[PDB]
Amino acid sequence: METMLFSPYTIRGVTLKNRIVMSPMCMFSCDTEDGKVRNWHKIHYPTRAVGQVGLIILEATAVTAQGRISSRDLGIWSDEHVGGLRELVSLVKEHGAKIGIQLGHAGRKSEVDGEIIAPSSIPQSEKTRTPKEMTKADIEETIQAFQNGARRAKEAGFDIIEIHAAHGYLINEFLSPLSNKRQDEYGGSPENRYRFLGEVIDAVKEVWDGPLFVRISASDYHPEGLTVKDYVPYAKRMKKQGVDLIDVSSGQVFPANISVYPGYQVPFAETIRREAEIATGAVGLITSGWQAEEILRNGRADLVFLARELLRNPYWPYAAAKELGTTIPAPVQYERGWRF
Amino acid sequence: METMLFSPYTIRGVTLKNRIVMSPMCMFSCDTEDGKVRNWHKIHYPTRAVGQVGLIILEATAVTAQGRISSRDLGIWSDEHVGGLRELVSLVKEHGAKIGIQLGHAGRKSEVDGEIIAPSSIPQSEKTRTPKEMTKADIEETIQAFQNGARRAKEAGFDIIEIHAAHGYLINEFLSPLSNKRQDEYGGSPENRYRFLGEVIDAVKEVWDGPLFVRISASDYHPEGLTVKDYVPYAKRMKKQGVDLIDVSSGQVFPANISVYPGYQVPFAETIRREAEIATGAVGLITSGWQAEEILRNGRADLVFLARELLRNPYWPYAAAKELGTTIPAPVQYERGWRF
Amino acid sequence: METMLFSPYTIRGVTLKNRIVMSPMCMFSCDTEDGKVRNWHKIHYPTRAVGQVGLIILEATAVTAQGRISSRDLGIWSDEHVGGLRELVSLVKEHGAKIGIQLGHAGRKSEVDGEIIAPSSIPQSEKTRTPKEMTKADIEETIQAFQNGARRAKEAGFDIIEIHAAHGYLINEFLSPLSNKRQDEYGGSPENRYRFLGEVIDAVKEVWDGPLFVRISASDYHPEGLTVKDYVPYAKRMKKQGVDLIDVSSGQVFPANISVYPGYQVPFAETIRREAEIATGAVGLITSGWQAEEILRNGRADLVFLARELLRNPYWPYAAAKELGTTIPAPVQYERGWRF
Amino acid sequence: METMLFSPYTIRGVTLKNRIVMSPMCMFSCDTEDGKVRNWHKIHYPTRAVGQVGLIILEATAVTAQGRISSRDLGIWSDEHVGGLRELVSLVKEHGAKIGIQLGHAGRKSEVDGEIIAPSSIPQSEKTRTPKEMTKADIEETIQAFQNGARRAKEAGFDIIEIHAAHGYLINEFLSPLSNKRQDEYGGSPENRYRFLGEVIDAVKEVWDGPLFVRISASDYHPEGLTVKDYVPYAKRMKKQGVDLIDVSSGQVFPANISVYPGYQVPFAETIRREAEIATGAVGLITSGWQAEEILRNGRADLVFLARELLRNPYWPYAAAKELGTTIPAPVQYERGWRF
Numbered sequence A, B, C, D: 001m002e003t004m005l006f007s008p009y010t011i012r013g014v015t016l017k018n019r020i021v022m023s024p025m026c027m028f029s030c031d032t033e034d035g036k037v038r039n040w041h042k043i044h045y046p047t048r049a050v051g052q053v054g055l056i057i058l059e060a061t062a063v064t065a066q067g068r069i070s071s072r073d074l075g076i077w078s079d080e081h082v083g084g085l086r087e088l089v090s091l092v093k094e095h096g097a098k099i100g101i102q103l104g105h106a107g108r109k110s111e112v113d114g115e116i117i118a119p120s121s122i123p124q125s126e127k128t129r130t131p132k133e134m135t136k137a138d139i140e141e142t143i144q145a146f147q148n149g150a151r152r153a154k155e156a157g158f159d160i161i162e163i164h165a166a167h168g169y170l171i172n173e174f175l176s177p178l179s180n181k182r183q184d185e186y187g188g189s190p191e192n193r194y195r196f197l198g199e200v201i202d203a204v205k206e207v208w209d210g211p212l213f214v215r216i217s218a219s220d221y222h223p224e225g226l227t228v229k230d231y232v233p234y235a236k237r238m239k240k241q242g243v244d245l246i247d248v249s250s251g252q253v254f255p256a257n258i259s260v261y262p263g264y265q266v267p268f269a270e271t272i273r274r275e276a277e278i279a280t281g282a283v284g285l286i287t288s289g290w291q292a293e294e295i296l297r298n299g300r301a302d303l304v305f306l307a308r309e310l311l312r313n314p315y316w317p318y319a320a321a322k323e324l325g326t327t328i329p330a331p332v333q334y335e336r337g338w339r340f
């Protein structure tokens, strides 16, 4: 029973057992408000590894306390976070899943109390706070925080790191001309608006030589913002800097009313894959095994990412295999229930 | 929810109530072996019209008796066939379906007793018979038989006509260099191997002014054969000759093995639609309403063709509406059962 | 996996190929308003025989014009009706299905113009017309119409006859104390209210030796009306008179609605089956193969009746076999679609 | 639609939020071979509590080391087991589920090294070991082990206790004349063969005042073994002793090969419920919301037990609610996916 959905995939000596990925999903469940792993996370993430998902990516994890979305986020801004993340790594990997971490900074979308920072002092909307415009010292300090976060992730035992450059947060605010009005070398041209992302990538590669992903918002959905043609030259540069895969999302940069439907972001993933010759991940209302097999076999992406479907059924790989008429290995404790 | 699957579609005066098409499927049910419509056909085709399919296309209907696949095929080589075909048109259109017919000739894949014909004297495999190499008289007669079929179909009251240029049958044999070895003006170059189809199209347009479809095999799956790049200039020719829509299939030219999977021929249909600027229809392992709405909304085709799924469930349009969370009109007798 | 659902069942020399029955459903499609079969019926009923239903029972067919529910009903009050009914017998049985007919009289629920009849001059509700109370001449005449209908059904070639004694129509109106207030020998005790049904059964048996069904409403859903415990002695008497199977429905006697749920009338079918030791049919929100196998294997009924599900999917037996993990014979034309 | 499946149920002061139960299932995952709770159990059981199951019952938990089925079973023979079991109770109850424990002793079906015990010295089959026939002192010691296990369950915080009297294990060996050949007061009449179970129940009630379940095998499937008529007087006695619910299974006493089908043990649950006037649990090939609602609404049982279906989909309650057209509360972290 040949499917491509259940075939392995290798990225520089890390091999995933199938093409299914659990997409990063904030849980707002750090009840002690100090960034640390709690019981909620130690059941939530291993459930999907028992369910035979090949790669589990943690929710947006803040590289400074000021870069959290909410006070109940996970964090990696302290050497004290390494012990709890290491325990989580061990509980997921015992089931044969590999594990990744999404490194985040919320920028002008931070909801935490106190000062918040951004490339330019413009609020996201009339209902949100005006941020402080970063100085050159703030830029150097934030690039160093991403480096320190990557070192701690290596020390905890993660297999993959992803940089969050999407959905209107700090790095996306530097990339889009809707939010970046700067007059120094970090603004004022397509090359200068890339510079913050390029320096974050270079700083992570100084301490991390394993698989590296970047997640992007391929369109701003605005007449004066970016579209996928602007991201084709940016993806070519990321490949030269040693990024292995682009995880292709869209929007949340500007309030916009957009039409949503099955696979509505798949064309962005295939444009980047074919025009820049780099591996890609697809995401957005992917909910069935039949659908996912078509995406992979026609070369539209290399990995399929699922978020809301794995909140409804965390053992979706069993259901997807039945739909495709194939079989997969089961946890030995569940063999009497996993009949094909 | 407004969907594209249940939106109308108009071609040169003919309006289809939705984008769903029942693909042509031989039934081998002419038990008198004279090509005439039988009781089986008068239940089989009207069942799918009650089911709310927008357009129903009859099985390959042979334009000469020598051009049948089997002795139990439907035929249109006599004025005697008009009467039984007219009754069938009337039974289908009662329910709001439009109806079309696929004119065919089997060439060297014919299984009927006696002499069979081809563009060159090469059999399909080592297990099949060797065809006679067609003379110039044979060519003009066969072109003429296609014109007579179209005239008879217009007389019977069909809405749409389709020419069968695919799956290794007679027109496909002229198109392919794997089977056409001719040294006259019907072989030896891209312009020459197109000529037979070009003439068949012109002869049909002499007697028929309604929507005209053509079905192609977009790849031979063979190192020395055709690929979709060869069919882009052919589709531009057909558009200029007044063909309205290309029905995109593939294969069955060369005895071989190929791996099939959901939507495996959709990339051929999108390449023809985009590069030759002509409407297309997609076919091949399309089974769900979720899948069909993706094809249409990402612009990969204009109509979706189903075969085996309509043998398993002839009222598939109700089930597809329910999967997409929309509603469609039901036959008034069935309103207590068709609850959305 | 062998199932009872797809095992044969023999009654008095008639063998059904499985336990699945198309329950009677009015179509309101006699557009010439003379009771004759139309093209609608000649597609509708054979579609379910192609889908492999074992027994197809026609909609309520009126034994007098006055006994029609509406002007567009099927009828059997004239020898002229035999010809069209026999065409429909031939079209259904060609596929291996057996065929039955439900003989009806609408009573005080009739909607046709002019005088309507009933045991007692009481309207069904405030909004309906008041009926004439039947004389003894009217009772004898109406019994004779049921006998003539059965003779016509034998002549047309039916395999099974069913008497409609349910859903508040004429015979149900004699059985219930809610509707029957008579003071002659047709009212005022359990034996007197049974008398009209007992006399219809004897008159049919004078002309018909094949399988005989009766459909009942086993509860009135009223504190002063009938319950299943009243029907147990009536079923013991029906067995002595030569009825072969009781088709067990409920309600529609008092003008109120009730809360329904899956299998809500199965306890009535099993109480009649076990306490009167007679074969029974179950009906009401039976929609899946898993459900149908449980009814049969636990001895709750001998045949399963489906109405609304067979309007949504007329090839349900293929889907039920896949759900149960078993295989069934397919029509030869559909073998490449009906994969198990 | 209000359903009974999602209505609450109260037993002697414990309220369950719905009627769905996770049936006991051995995991053979105590890798330290000392009966203690491990990381496997701390993810496996809370997964179904997040999935909104109302009552979770732990796998057979051995009251002595000699009563284990395998060396990898959970146990409750030491005060050192209480700490790990209490942690597991807290992790499950955090989500609104209630939690139970099944107390077991494998008798002659034990696989551990050394001596094993039974009412009589007859092996289970030719391939298994001959057990020691128990003395009166062995009987007193084993009843005391069940009491000590019940006391530790209370110390750990469980809501419900179940006694395992089924599937051929030690208490079932005393009940059945196939395995009990004793000539003293524990064998040779229906009252004498009940005596071991009756003394276990009384010893548990001395230390436990909460809800008490007993699981039975209602048939041995053997001409000289027990049938459901033997268990009607047993269930009347258990009610008098203060048992609150009978959990009704069958078989695994003698090597019969019975033919199973959906709901094949539900008629046993309904016979005990109606004849002894005691609440019952139904189990056995129950997989759909449609099926479970019929069992409850037709009064066949009070709770529905699932085993293999919750190994395939641990969030089954979400799917069953959708199938029945109702809604239920979701974990707040999952509200964006649990849409209905």
Ligand SMILES: Cc1cc2nc3c(=O)[nH]c(=O)nc-3n(C[C@H](O)[C@H](O)[C@H](O)COP(=O)(O)O)c2cc1C
Residues within 6 Å of the ligand: A023, A024, A025, A026, A027, A059, A060, A102, A164, A166, A167, A215, A249, A283, A284, A285, A286, A305, A306, A307, A308, A309, D333, D336, D337
């Ligand atoms: C509760 C929730 C939390 C999410 N958190 C993140 C996140 O931390 N980082 C991120 O890049 N996307 C996040 N997303 C977006 C998803 O990863 C995904 O891109 C989106 O929901 C579309 O995929 P789906 O249709 O499979 O849900 C979140 C989505 C949800 C519903």
Ligand SMILES: Cc1cc2nc3c(=O)[nH]c(=O)nc-3n(C[C@H](O)[C@H](O)[C@H](O)COP(=O)(O)O)c2cc1C
Residues within 6 Å of the ligand: B023, B024, B025, B026, B027, B059, B060, B102, B164, B166, B167, B215, B249, B283, B284, B285, B286, B305, B306, B307, B308, B309, C333, C336, C337
């Ligand atoms: C029984 C059967 C008969 C068919 N007959 C024809 C035919 O007469 N002409 C044609 O062009 N294709 C014919 N086909 C091919 C189908 O039209 C369709 O292209 C193919 O089955 C793939 O679509 P599907 O996956 O929806 O079945 C037939 C297929 C089947 C199974």
Ligand SMILES: Cc1cc2nc3c(=O)[nH]c(=O)nc-3n(C[C@H](O)[C@H](O)[C@H](O)COP(=O)(O)O)c2cc1C
Residues within 6 Å of the ligand: B333, B336, B337, C023, C024, C025, C026, C027, C059, C060, C102, C164, C167, C215, C249, C283, C284, C285, C286, C305, C306, C307, C308, C309
């Ligand atoms: C449109 C329609 C017509 C029906 N006509 C009849 C009828 O003529 N005679 C009869 O006994 N029941 C009739 N019924 C009742 C059905 O036979 C069946 O008893 C009922 O619909 C419950 O079964 P279901 O849940 O499978 O639909 C009809 C039901 C419908 C929806």
Ligand SMILES: Cc1cc2nc3c(=O)[nH]c(=O)nc-3n(C[C@H](O)[C@H](O)[C@H](O)COP(=O)(O)O)c2cc1C
Residues within 6 Å of the ligand: A333, A336, A337, D023, D024, D025, D026, D027, D059, D060, D102, D164, D166, D167, D215, D249, D283, D284, D285, D286, D305, D306, D307, D308, D309
């Ligand atoms: C892996 C497995 C372990 C089981 N362990 C137990 C057990 O410890 N105690 C018990 O009474 N039944 C046990 N059973 C039987 C189940 O509880 C249940 O009665 C049976 O599987 C039928 O229900 P189902 O069709 O929903 O699986 C087990 C079944 C399985 C498949």
